[PDB]
DNA sequence: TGTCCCCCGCGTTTTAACCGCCAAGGGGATTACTCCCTAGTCTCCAGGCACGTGTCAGATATATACATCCTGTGCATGTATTGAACAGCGACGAT
């Protein structure tokens, strides 16, 4: 259930890509082991009707 | 110590206390007289007190239940502190 759409320069994850933090998460070590570029999420989410 | 008000002092206004003098009868003081009541005396005896006794109302000891008195937990709420998640600005490389 880990799917990633790769075509040319377009990258998009159809199942798994975001995590819920690095504090205590073994994913932090996985990121230190496997080349993972981690980008923070800006929680600003505007709403339009 | 601090406030508010309750008397104190003083001038002006109002009242009746006080004094002086006369007029009158109510009642207290005083006397004379009579008898009813109480002190004094005697004899008579039961009402009242000492003495003895028997016992139950009450003091004492011991066990339990009730009251209460006070301090120590809880609660709840407000506030202070701290962590985290919004927000720079600039230098760099990739496009």
What's the gist of this structure?
The chain is α+β, with helices and mostly antiparallel strands.
Question: Topology of this structure?
Answer:
Layout lengths: L3 E4 L2 E4 L13 H7 L16
Antiparallel strand pairs: 1-2
This protein binds one DNA strand of 95 nucleotides through loops.
What does this structure look like?
- With 49 residues, this protein is an alpha+beta fold.
- The protein has one helix and two strands.
- Strands 1-2 form a two-stranded antiparallel sheet.
- A hairpin with a 2-residue loop joins strand 1 and strand 2 (10-13).
- The radius of gyration is 14 Å and the shape is extended.
- It is found in: Nucleus; Chromosome.
- This is Lysine-specific histone demethylase 1A.
- Belongs to the flavin monoamine oxidase family.
Q: What's the story with the biggest beta sheet? A: 2 strands, antiparallel
Overall form: extended
> Helicity range of the residues?
10-25%
- Which radius of gyration do the C-alpha atoms yield? 14 Å
Number of strands: 2
Structural class: alpha+beta
Number of helices: 1
| End-to-end Cα distance | 33 Å
- Adjacency order of strands in the biggest sheet: 1-2
Listing every helix as H and every strand as E from the N terminus to the C terminus, the arrangement reads EEH
Strand residues, percent = 15-25%
């Amino acid at each position: 259930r880990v799917a990633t759409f790769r075509k040319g320069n377009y990258v998009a994850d159809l199942g798994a890509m975001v995590v819920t933090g690095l504090g205590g998460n073994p994913m932090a070590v996985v990121s230190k082991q496997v080349n993972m570029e981690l980008a923070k999420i800006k929680q600003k989410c505007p709403l339009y009707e």
